[PDB]
Enzyme design. Sequence first.
Site: not given
Ligand SMILES: Nc1nc2c(ncn2[C@@H]2O[C@H](COP(=O)(O)OP(=O)(O)OP(=O)(O)O)[C@@H](O)[C@H]2O)c(=O)[nH]1
Ligand SMILES: Nc1nc2c(ncn2[C@@H]2O[C@H](COP(=O)(O)OP(=O)(O)OP(=O)(O)O)[C@@H](O)[C@H]2O)c(=O)[nH]1
Ligand SMILES: Nc1ncnc2c1ncn2[C@H]1C[C@H](O)[C@@H](COP(=O)(O)OP(=O)(O)OP(=O)(O)O)O1
Ligand SMILES: Nc1ncnc2c1ncn2[C@H]1C[C@H](O)[C@@H](COP(=O)(O)OP(=O)(O)OP(=O)(O)O)O1
Lengths: 466, 458, 461, 455
Positions: C4, C6, C24, C43, C120, C258, C261
């Site tokens: 399981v 989460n 795994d 961004v 891909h 996605y 700009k």
């Molecule tokens: N196996 C595995 N578990 C993951 C991964 N990412 C998150 N998990 C969670 O990590 C939890 C704990 O790891 P387990 O592999 O169950 O480890 P464990 O409980 O010590 O070993 P088991 O006795 O095999 O269950 C799992 O039950 C998953 O919910 C992953 O890439 N692989």
């Molecule tokens: N500057 C900066 N922006 C970030 C970062 N992480 C997320 N952002 C967001 O990404 C957007 C990126 O654009 P900017 O750095 O503003 O780039 P830009 O709009 O071409 O440049 P400006 O003309 O200064 O606005 C920002 O408006 C933020 O919301 C970070 O680490 N640095």
């Molecule tokens: N109390 C909790 N509430 C919400 N999420 C949890 C809780 N405990 C663990 N998780 C999450 C982490 C994992 O993605 C998933 C299963 O974890 P968990 O049940 O703790 O370990 P485990 O399943 O490996 O134990 P075991 O193998 O002994 O059953 O749930």
């Molecule tokens: N339509 C949208 N809805 C929700 N979040 C957005 C949207 N467009 C951008 N964001 C997010 C990504 C950034 O964390 C933050 C600001 O992005 P954006 O407004 O696109 O600024 P920008 O810096 O790219 O434009 P500008 O400098 O021209 O104002 O909001």
Amino acid sequence: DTMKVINDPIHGHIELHPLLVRIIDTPQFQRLRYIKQLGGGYYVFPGASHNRFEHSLGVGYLAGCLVHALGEKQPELQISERDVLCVQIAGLCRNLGHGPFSHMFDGRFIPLARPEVKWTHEQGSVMMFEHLINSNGIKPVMEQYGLIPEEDICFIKEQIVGPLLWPYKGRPENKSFLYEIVSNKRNGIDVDKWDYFARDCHHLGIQNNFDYKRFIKFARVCEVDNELRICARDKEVGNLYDMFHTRNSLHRRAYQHKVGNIIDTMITDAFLKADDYIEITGAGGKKYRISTAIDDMEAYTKLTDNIFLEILYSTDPKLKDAREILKQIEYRNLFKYVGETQPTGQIKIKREDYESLPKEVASAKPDVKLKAEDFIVDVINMDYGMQEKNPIDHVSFYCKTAPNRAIRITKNQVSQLLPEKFAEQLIRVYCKKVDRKSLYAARQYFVQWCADRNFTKPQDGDVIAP
Amino acid sequence: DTMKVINDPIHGHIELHPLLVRIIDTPQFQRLRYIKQLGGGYYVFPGASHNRFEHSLGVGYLAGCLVHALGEKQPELQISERDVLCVQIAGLCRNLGHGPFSHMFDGRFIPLARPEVKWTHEQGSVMMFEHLINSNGIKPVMEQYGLIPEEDICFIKEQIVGPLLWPYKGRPENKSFLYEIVSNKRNGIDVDKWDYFARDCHHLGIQNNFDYKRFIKFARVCEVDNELRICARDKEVGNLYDMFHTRNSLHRRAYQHKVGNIIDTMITDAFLKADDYIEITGAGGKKYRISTAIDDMEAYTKLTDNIFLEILYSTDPKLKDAREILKQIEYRNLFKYVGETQPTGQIKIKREDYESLPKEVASAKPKVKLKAEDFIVDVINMDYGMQEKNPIDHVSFYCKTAPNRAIRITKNQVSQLLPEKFAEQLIRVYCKKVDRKSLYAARQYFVQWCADRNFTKP
Amino acid sequence: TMKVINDPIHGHIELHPLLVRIIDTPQFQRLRYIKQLGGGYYVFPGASHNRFEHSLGVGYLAGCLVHALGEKQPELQISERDVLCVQIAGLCRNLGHGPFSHMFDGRFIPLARPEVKWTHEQGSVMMFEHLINSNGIKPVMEQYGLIPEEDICFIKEQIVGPLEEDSLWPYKGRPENKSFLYEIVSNKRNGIDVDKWDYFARDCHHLGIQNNFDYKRFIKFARVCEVDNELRICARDKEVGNLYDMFHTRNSLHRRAYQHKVGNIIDTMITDAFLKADDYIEITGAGGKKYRISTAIDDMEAYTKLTDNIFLEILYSTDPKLKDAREILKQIEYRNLFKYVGETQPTGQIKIKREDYESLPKEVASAKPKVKLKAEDFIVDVINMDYGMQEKNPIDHVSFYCKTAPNRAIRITKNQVSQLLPEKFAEQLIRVYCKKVDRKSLYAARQYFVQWCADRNFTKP
Amino acid sequence: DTMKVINDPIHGHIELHPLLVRIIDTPQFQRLRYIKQLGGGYYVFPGASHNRFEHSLGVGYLAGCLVHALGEKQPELQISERDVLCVQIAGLCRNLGHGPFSHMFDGRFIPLARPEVKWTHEQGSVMMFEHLINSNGIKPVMEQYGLIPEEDICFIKEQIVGPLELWPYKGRPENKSFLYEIVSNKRNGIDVDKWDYFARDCHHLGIQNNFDYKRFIKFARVCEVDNELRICARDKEVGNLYDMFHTRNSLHRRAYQHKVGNIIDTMITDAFLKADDYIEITGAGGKKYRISTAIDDMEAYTKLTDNIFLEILYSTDPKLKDAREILKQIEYRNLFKYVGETQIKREDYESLPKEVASAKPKVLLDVKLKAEDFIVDVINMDYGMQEKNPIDHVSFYCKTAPNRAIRITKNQVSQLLPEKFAEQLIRVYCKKVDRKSLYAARQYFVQWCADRNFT
Ligand SMILES: Nc1nc2c(ncn2[C@@H]2O[C@H](COP(=O)(O)OP(=O)(O)OP(=O)(O)O)[C@@H](O)[C@H]2O)c(=O)[nH]1
Ligand SMILES: Nc1nc2c(ncn2[C@@H]2O[C@H](COP(=O)(O)OP(=O)(O)OP(=O)(O)O)[C@@H](O)[C@H]2O)c(=O)[nH]1
Ligand SMILES: Nc1ncnc2c1ncn2[C@H]1C[C@H](O)[C@@H](COP(=O)(O)OP(=O)(O)OP(=O)(O)O)O1
Ligand SMILES: Nc1ncnc2c1ncn2[C@H]1C[C@H](O)[C@@H](COP(=O)(O)OP(=O)(O)OP(=O)(O)O)O1
Ligand SMILES: Nc1ncnc2c1ncn2[C@H]1C[C@H](O)[C@@H](COP(=O)(O)OP(=O)(O)OP(=O)(O)O)O1
Ligand SMILES: Nc1ncnc2c1ncn2[C@H]1C[C@H](O)[C@@H](COP(=O)(O)OP(=O)(O)OP(=O)(O)O)O1
Ligand SMILES: [Mg+2]
Ligand SMILES: [Mg+2]
Ligand SMILES: [Mg+2]
Ligand SMILES: [Mg+2]
């Protein structure tokens, strides 16, 4: 006195100025606790238990967020606390006029019960607001916080209903943008929608595609044709198209749900059959009907979803017909959805034509014969909130490099994937007879009628009418 | 037939078997649309507009999830569709008996209006359920889907209210675990709590710290003292302690909110002043009162939050006193909070004692005279749902390495940070007279009474 | 029995041990080190999610849908074998993604190996094969009742489409009566599949944006019916509006995130840096053979080691050979980015083809404005907005059923649904950026751009 | 210059002042994109992909919300924009010092690799902050927005780490004392760092979410307490503060101290130990550092992130074979094995595996085990102040007298609260995974529990 804090699930902890609290704590406002936001929608979406009251709080809050954001960003606009409070009051109170089951009341019941009158909930909100202020001694409280009641009450009313050259008295042209917040008559982009998108989605089981908070942060006031208007950042235009897409999705899925509508229709029918018998006491003990309560606010104050239960629980034999309809709702013996179609023509079916439509479907000649009384035909107008117009054409924008220059952005500048049309009509048909034989026949009539009228082929035509 | 699907905001798209739909689509069930989950809580938490109806759907659904999960994991248990449906029906219907403003009605109004009777909403649910089935021809529909009404109706009632040696008739000892799902009388861990935690939190704006879906995935049936019981995985024990913590957080913040409670109190007061004049038509056109509608299910069917508005909107001068109280709620002119005691560990004061308390506070002679009718005294319990007992001591667990062996886990095995006590009580006092002079006096009486009783605090 | 997990989007998910065995492995765990949205994280700070967790979500939802169908329709004879194969395909369809996801096959490989045709999906199929063969999974598959020859073919087909010419039924892994199984993971007929459903929910959760389509509803209304002698998944008729909303959401997510700009320019700068580092970074593949970033796709043992880590390897290097690549990444950190010059208005259809993209900077540089920059100074980004099938409406390729006749499949045309829907289902625009960031260079780039727009008969600033 | 807006899923659209942007857009800050909030937790909770970077933005934001709320409510406090920015900077930067896999690095790796040194991420945050400011010419920018660097840099450092060397702070005077309570509250641990991580970790882990943290800001007021101006909470809120520490503890039990998350952190630590001598990190002047010594030079530390994990995993160097094998075992899920648990001081931790190996069990064994084969994990569960109740160190005010600070004791609130505020468990794991090694490890463990008492 300073602020009350209210925990709202949509907006979190909201601060309310004592003047607003005073307004809220009145019979006229608290009434909204007993009016469901989505009327008959609750009978389809069990999470939609929310009432107009909590929605009104949300609208007043958001109104305040926007006016404050503008004042902080643009000190030159000279926005005062007085303005802020007036805007918030208008936001809080724009839903005051809603009747039982919200849009069922002014959308269905009043048009059928008083075809001579022209009534909207907005008009009701203005009247109810007057009555609220006057009845509860709010004017002196307003003065105590720096409002000037004559100007400001007019301003508040104007914000809700529009005007009662610059046609507004409550504020001058240089505060024009204030009228764009609560109920935007130019394009419908206002805080009312933003609250309901978030709130309805939360209760409905959906999540909104447009973010109100983002829009507030990018809003700026610029001069547009000698008016100071709220403009949006150019970047945001796609979001605005998304906003109206969301609105339309919400109409398709919930507000015009085929069953929600038929339940609204059955309630309306029941109100119509009860209208002559239910008495609602208004001013001076004068008695009103459900359909006339709108003429007196003291009577209207008492007109809520409660009327539904009053009819349901009655024993008076005069109400037997109305009561039977509501009882059928409870057993889920509702009328059956047969199909949906649209006109292919650009000309729309007009309100006066609606009545003749069941006769027409029954007339169509495709086991059991069906009459006009057996059919229900529901004409639904779906659009972007301004009939045929594209509301985005009525939005001003600004670009990053020139914040003060307002510009228009046309649809073709944004995407070729947007709608070619901004308004349409859907015709839904229902059958009152619920047995399989009656249903099969209803289907045949429907498909034949669609072919006769040159309407669009129902989606299930091949199956229901081979 | 096939299933109806309902979109619930808490659980998403839920499938309902047609027999369940048939039960839902009745006046008796649909009634729940007009009863607020949190009663007067809505007058404090504006998001708490939800009614018992939607909560009931959630409970039925989760009941079904659990019974299905067990049947799928453990075919040897021989769980039938019949069992599944019975469990779901019980889950759907355990809230049927609730009256106006939910816990206000059986917690405040009925105890004051009919002190001689012993009424709980659970008993109401059982009577309503009988009325629903009989009135609407459900028994033949039950048979049509493989149920055996005599056994299964008894089973459904038992699941809601407990027994009417193995004390149950509806199912044998080898299906004992079925009784643990809807209303768990051993330890209170059941699907009703899981739904209301999620739903209340969603509407209130608070957070649920317990994951119910997780609990279902780790649930297993094992033999415990010659009974087949639902057991939880050992590592889930911390989560179960969290579950009761959440419950208590929800009580502190919302269910026992000072102002939500005073509003429930004012509504109760108004119902009391109106009880003699409101008429509710029952069977054969007989007229009932609010306090007697619980004796006829046809009348009870129409007793909902609507009564509030019927009083508020009345013009009859006999109702003027009740109407005034409700009007005071609208203007926010509420009964006034005087004080509360500090919590004491006992859960000393019993339900039967509550009624005498205002007389007592009025009797206190401190260093404007007030009567018992002027005071309201609200006894507030905080516990883990079983008075002084730790419910986790009444839970069976299993370990990964031995899934069929049930074990107990004690508090000290889990954490030293857990409570040393599992129950406490507070007393809140309110005054119906709101004029400064009356308030000052009420405070005096209160402080004196606290000293007389050996309680404490402002 | 089951593990399981989460997940924040789907809650507690059960995984069959065979799936766990596949997860795994180095090949699967690799996905922990590849950001779903590549440069989008620069961004949208919430977009820290990697392909790994998305893949778990896809496998889960695949399983939900196949199970829902088998429960509703026992007559379909869906076996546990089928369930597992579908879940495996859902888990593994993202295996082929390279560093910064779409940056790698969308930008880097086309520039670094213009002679190769690589996606891909094709990578996923190769990586899947390498995962099974490297970790002894085939015997485990047989231990749980799978038949590797048929089922591995089936799993590959579900990811990449037919491997094997006019035509009728082109699939080998399953017959026409199980056709519906191919509609779950990667639906080549209309793009409605569980991959989208997971990414909608997950991206919105991390982005802070909102998904307008509910995947779980669609599963509950899905039914298999006969369509042209194939058993196909059909949707309930009234769901058609929801399917249109689904493609709207998709497009909202493209516009906002996605194809943001700045997210795109950051992907571009990363691409540039990979290009300048390509000769110096060595990735050991099979037999100790050394590969480059651009040639790691020829050997899955090398590809296994090719993740977002390469970015940090370049950033933190001290080797003077890598100074140029390192400088670009450093400019990302200081936020001194390649500069946005302008974009055209959208034009209907997808006139400019993938093959044409490379010539475009040369063209902009060729423009002679009335009032000097080289092709290497410009970046030209072609942005497609469509419904996932070029000019076609995918909903025309969906079958539906009505309540009254659940076994009869039907078509629903656009005009039957709404007149508010798009008249066109595809469009394109062009964005231009400049690598030189000084004011002089920028002013010039604007001139070239405007002139080029006039020459080509395009529009907008 | 206007604000940048950033969309954060937890807080929504956040506005950042350009000075803050200038600090964020540096190698020293951006580094935090490559350090997972929960370290090995991501290998158990797949949604926990979040890094320190986004958490730091959240902390800076919430710091700013609180300081602004106070200034708006209480103009008499004379809070300036300068103060606001300094607080926000401190909130942004308090996580700067975190190393690979966050608490794994200062909690496990550094104590084992450099037992002689006393290092915490906070100290790292202060040194990194100095390096960030000096390396990137930030001081002139600070001046350009009205800060006074000498005072304000000191103030910012003090907010992160406490007094550097009576009022012990130099950065602000006693009448601005409340400012020191926002970012890292040394009196009771109630600060914006916790509020962000509660919301964010829950969002990513898949535990459910709440707004109580914004509530706390709305009810916060400054009052005089013992001749200091302190932030006080409304009396009403005391139950919520208890809930806050309950939540914190729930999160520790479920996630931060998950048995398997911790063992993965332990395996990563082990691999870092076996790689420490061979990985080179270039610092100032081209000097080479190790993973364990990178903390002595901030130019080297800047380059020390989760990336190291992959550098080891993907290496072909035969010197790294042992470290690489451990990481490979993580990928195949062949983890160090849990032996058992039993219900004291930090200095003692390192000696514990030696002690468990020393235990002589009665039983006949197939193998002998060494200290290096055992891992012993001491797990503290508390309310963040060892044995103390942090609520005893909170001041409150009542509605009727907002300026008068008061104390509220535990017994005034509920008898259902904990009698104890700290506890400990010991978990033991074995690095050898064969059945023979496991059986033996069990024996040593049980014997050691009997020898020490507390069986
Ligand atoms: N196996 C595995 N578990 C993951 C991964 N990412 C998150 N998990 C969670 O990590 C939890 C704990 O790891 P387990 O592999 O169950 O480890 P464990 O409980 O010590 O070993 P088991 O006795 O095999 O269950 C799992 O039950 C998953 O919910 C992953 O890439 N692989
Ligand atoms: N500057 C900066 N922006 C970030 C970062 N992480 C997320 N952002 C967001 O990404 C957007 C990126 O654009 P900017 O750095 O503003 O780039 P830009 O709009 O071409 O440049 P400006 O003309 O200064 O606005 C920002 O408006 C933020 O919301 C970070 O680490 N640095
Ligand atoms: N109390 C909790 N509430 C919400 N999420 C949890 C809780 N405990 C663990 N998780 C999450 C982490 C994992 O993605 C998933 C299963 O974890 P968990 O049940 O703790 O370990 P485990 O399943 O490996 O134990 P075991 O193998 O002994 O059953 O749930
Ligand atoms: N339509 C949208 N809805 C929700 N979040 C957005 C949207 N467009 C951008 N964001 C997010 C990504 C950034 O964390 C933050 C600001 O992005 P954006 O407004 O696109 O600024 P920008 O810096 O790219 O434009 P500008 O400098 O021209 O104002 O909001
Ligand atoms: N602990 C809590 N968490 C979340 N919401 C709460 C909590 N306590 C109360 N609420 C809700 C109910 C109300 O909508 C809002 C304010 O309630 P509350 O703070 O109790 O104010 P109040 O007006 O009852 O007290 P006072 O007048 O003493 O300040 O918050
Ligand atoms: N597009 C949608 N998205 C989310 N929820 C929806 C949508 N449409 C309807 N709902 C809700 C309302 C109901 O609670 C539940 C079932 O609605 P729906 O499928 O519309 O059933 P119905 O009974 O009207 O149609 P039918 O009887 O033709 O299946 O789902
Ligand atoms: Mg109050
Ligand atoms: Mg239906
Ligand atoms: Mg496990
Ligand atoms: Mg920008």
